[PDB]
Design a protein around this ligand. Structure first.
Ligand code: CL
Lengths: 237, 201
C-alpha cells in the first residue's frame, strides 16, 4: 500500500523538513493533501508520473519531487505555524485514491511549550464492583503538548481493545490559552473477578511524539523527547 | 461556494438502524464518486466507489448515485457503534485527475442500553496523583454529558465501551480535579443526568 515518514514532527518556525511517501502498487498518480478541522482534504501538489509534478489547491509554501514512480517527496523549507496540520499522501491506478497513514506536523514559535504526558491509572471503585460485578480502570494522560499521543492498554503482556474506550480527541487543560496543554482519558472495564485476581497486570501505555534528541534543550526540566510513559496497576481482593 | 457539500453532523443513529449519509456536488459532468471512512486520528479508508446511476452494495454498505439529482448517498444497514467515524464524500469533476473531498459527516451510532444503571463512582490513584477522579457510567445513550464551566474541572465526552466476550456495551464519562470543592456528588452538575442516578457512600 501507501506508507509515509515521519508519522509525527515538531518544528520551530523557520526550520525545514521532508515527508516521504512510498507505494509499491505500480500507481502512476500520487497526491499530497493537508487536512484541517472543518474543511475537506485540500490537495497541495500531485504527480501524473515519475519526474513530473503539478500544483493542487494550496501549493504555497511546499515543494515536491517525484524521483521514481514509487516515491513522492513533500518539502517545507521555512516552517510557518499555518503549516500545523495532518498531511496525507495518496496514490491511484486511475481515479481511486488509497491514503497513507498521515503525518501530524506541529509548528511552534518556541519548543519550551512542549511537554510529555504525566500518566496515572486509577483503580476501580469498590461501590462499582459491588453494584455491577464489573471493574472500570481509568487512565489519565495530562499536561501534554502538542496533541501527539497514542494510548493503549496492555493486560498481562497483550494489547487489548475489548472493554476499552479512549476519548477520540483530547481536552484542553485551559480552553482559554491558545497553546493549552492537553489531557486524554481512557477506560478499561473488566469483570470484578478478573480485577480481584492479583495475578493480573494492567498497564496504560502513552506514546508521546515530542522533540528529537538532536533538538537544542537548555531548560532544567527533562527535554520533552518522543517517549513512552506507562502507569500500571495489579488486581486486589 | 463548495463543489462537494455534506452536513457536518454529528448525525446520531440508534444501533441496528440504517444510517443515511448524503452528498451533493455542483459539477454535473462528474464521472467518479467515493465514500471514505475516517476514524479520529486515522487515515481515510475506501468504503464505496460508484460510477453508474443506481445502487451498489458491499456488505452492510449501499452507495446510491443519481446524476440527474446530483446526489450520492451511503446507507449503512445494521449500524454498529464501531461505524462511528467521519464519512468523506469525494467526486472526480470534469477533466480533473484528483478527487475533490467534502468536509465530511460525523456519524455517531448510540448503543441500546438494555438495563440503564446510571451511577457516579470514585476512583483513587493506584500510586499517587493529586487527582480525585469520578466515573459516570451505565447511563442510557439519550443522556448527554456537558463540559464543566468550573475552572480546573475536566469532564470527557460520553464514550462507548464494548466488552465483546459478555455482549455488553456501556457509556461512561470521566470528571477529575485536584480542587477541594470537587466531589463526585457535584462533578456532573452542568449535565442533565437521571434522578435515580446512584451516588454511593
Ligand atoms: Cl481484544
Amino acid at each position: 500500500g501507501v506508507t509515509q515518514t515521519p508519522k509525527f514532527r515538531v518544528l520551530k518556525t523557520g526550520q525545514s523538513m521532508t515527508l516521504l511517501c512510498a507505494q509499491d502498487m505500480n500507481h502512476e498518480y500520487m497526491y499530497w493533501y493537508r487536512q484541517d478541522p472543518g474543511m475537506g482534504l485540500r490537495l497541495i501538489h500531485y504527480s501524473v508520473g515519475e519526474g513530473t509534478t503539478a500544483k493542487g489547491e494550496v501549493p504555497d509554501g511546499y515543494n515536491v519531487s517525484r524521483l521514481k514512480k514509487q516515491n513522492f517527496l513533500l518539502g517545507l523549507e521555512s516552517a510557518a505555524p499555518s503549516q500545523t496540520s495532518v498531511y496525507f499522501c495518496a496514490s491511484s491506478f486511475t481515479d481511486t485514491q488509497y491514503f497513507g497513514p498521515g503525518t501530524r506536523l506541529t509548528v511552534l514559535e518556541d519548543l519550551k511549550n512542549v511537554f510529555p504526558p504525566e500518566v496515572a491509572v486509577f483503580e476501580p471503585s469498590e461501590a462499582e464492583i459491588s453494584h455491577t460485578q464489573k471493574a472500570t480502570l481509568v487512565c489519565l494522560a495530562t499536561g501534554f503538548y502538542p496533541d501527539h499521543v497514542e494510548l493503549s492498554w496492555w493486560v498481562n503482556g497483550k494489547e487489548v481493545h475489548s472493554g476499552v474506550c479512549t476519548d477520540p480527541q483530547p481536552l484542553k487543560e485551559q480552553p482559554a490559552l491558545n497553546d493549552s496543554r492537553y489531557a486524554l482519558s481512557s477506560r478499561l472495564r473488566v469483570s470484578a473477578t478478573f480485577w480481584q485476581d492479583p495475578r493480573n497486570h494492567f498497564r496504560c501505555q502513552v506514546q508521546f511524539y515530542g522533540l528529537s534528541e538532536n533538538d537544542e534543550w537548555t531548560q532544567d526540566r527533562a527535554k520533552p523527547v518522543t517517549q513512552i510513559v506507562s502507569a500500571e496497576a495489579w488486581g486486589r481482593a | 461556494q463548495k463543489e462537494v457539500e455534506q452536513n457536518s453532523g454529528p448525525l446520531s443513529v440508534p444501533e441496528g438502524a440504517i444510517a443515511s449519509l448524503n452528498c451533493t456536488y455542483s459539477d454535473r459532468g462528474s464521472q467518479s464518486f467515493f465514500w471514505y471512512r475516517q476514524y479520529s486520528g486515522k487515515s481515510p479508508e475506501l468504503i464505496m466507489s460508484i460510477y453508474s446511476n443506481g445502487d451498489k452494495e458491499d456488505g452492510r454498505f449501499t452507495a446510491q448515485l443519481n446524476k440527474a439529482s446530483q446526489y450520492v448517498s451511503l446507507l449503512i444497514r445494521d449500524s454498529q457503534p464501531s461505524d462511528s467515524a467521519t464519512y468523506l464524500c469525494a467526486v472526480r469533476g470534469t477533466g480533473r485527475r484528483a478527487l475533490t473531498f467534502g468536509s465530511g459527516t460525523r456519524l455517531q451510532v448510540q448503543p441500546n442500553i438494555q438495563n440503564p444503571d446510571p451511577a457516579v463512582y470514585q476512583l483513587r490513584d493506584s500510586k499517587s496523583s493529586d487527582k480525585s477522579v469520578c466515573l459516570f457510567t451505565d447511563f442510557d445513550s439519550q443522556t448527554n454529558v456537558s463540559q464543566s464551566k468550573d475552572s480546573d474541572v475536566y469532564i470527557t465526552d460520553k464514550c462507548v465501551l464494548d466488552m465483546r466476550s459478555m455482549d455488553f456495551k456501556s457509556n461512561s464519562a470521566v470528571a477529575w480535579s485536584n480542587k477541594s470543592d470537587f466531589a463526585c456528588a457535584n462533578a456532573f452538575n452542568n449535565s442533565i443526568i437521571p434522578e435515580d442516578t446512584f451516588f454511593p457512600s
